């Protein structure tokens, strides 16, 4: 019964690590592109001048 | 929804800059021609 409950409550450390890897790589990208996206209005203002 | 509304609310800055410049040139030109016109009857009355 312990083994069965463990099958129900124990997961693939590998699968979780994979999901976190993908999420981590995505997050930095999101931050950087947000930073870049702020620039577009700035350049349209430069055009305004 | 926000993008859809934006597509109808705001005003394209490049186009507006172009139109503003155009209107400025036209206004200066008009002032100049009014001055020239005024000069015209001045010359004709001098001819008189």
Contact at CB, B17 and A44, closer than 8 angstroms = no
CA gap B42, B16 in Å, rounded = 39
- How remote is the C-alpha of B9 from its chain's centroid? 25
Compute and round to an integer the Cα radius of gyration of chain B. 21
CA gap A35, A9 in Å, rounded = 40
Residue that the structure tokens 């577009």 belong to? A40
Q: How far is A46 from chain B (nearest CA, A)?
A: 11
DSSP symbols for A26-38:
HHHHHHHHHHHHH
Cβ-Cβ contacts under 8 Å between A and B: the total is: 6
CA gap A2, A38 in Å, rounded = 54
- Kindly list the residues from chain A whose CB atom is less than 8 angstroms away from the CB atom of residue B14: 47
CA gap B40, B43 in Å, rounded = 5
How many degrees, rounded to 5, is the angle at CA B33 between CA B27 and CA B39? 145
Tell me if B13 sits within 8 A of A44, measured CB to CB.
yes
- B12, B13, B20, best to mutate vs chain A, most A CBs in 10 Å: B13
> What are the tokens at B28?
């200066």
Tell me if A48 sits within 8 A of B13, measured CB to CB.
yes
Experimental technique used to determine this entry: cryo-EM
> What are the tokens at B36?
């020239």
């Amino acid at each position: 019964l312990t083994s069965a409950r463990s099958r129900i409550e124990d997961s693939d450390y590998a699968t979780e690590v994979s999901n976190m890897s993908r999420a981590q790589i995505l997050q930095q990208a999101g931050t950087s592109v947000l930073a870049q996206a702020n620039q577009v209005p700035q350049n349209v203002l430069s055009l305004l001048r």
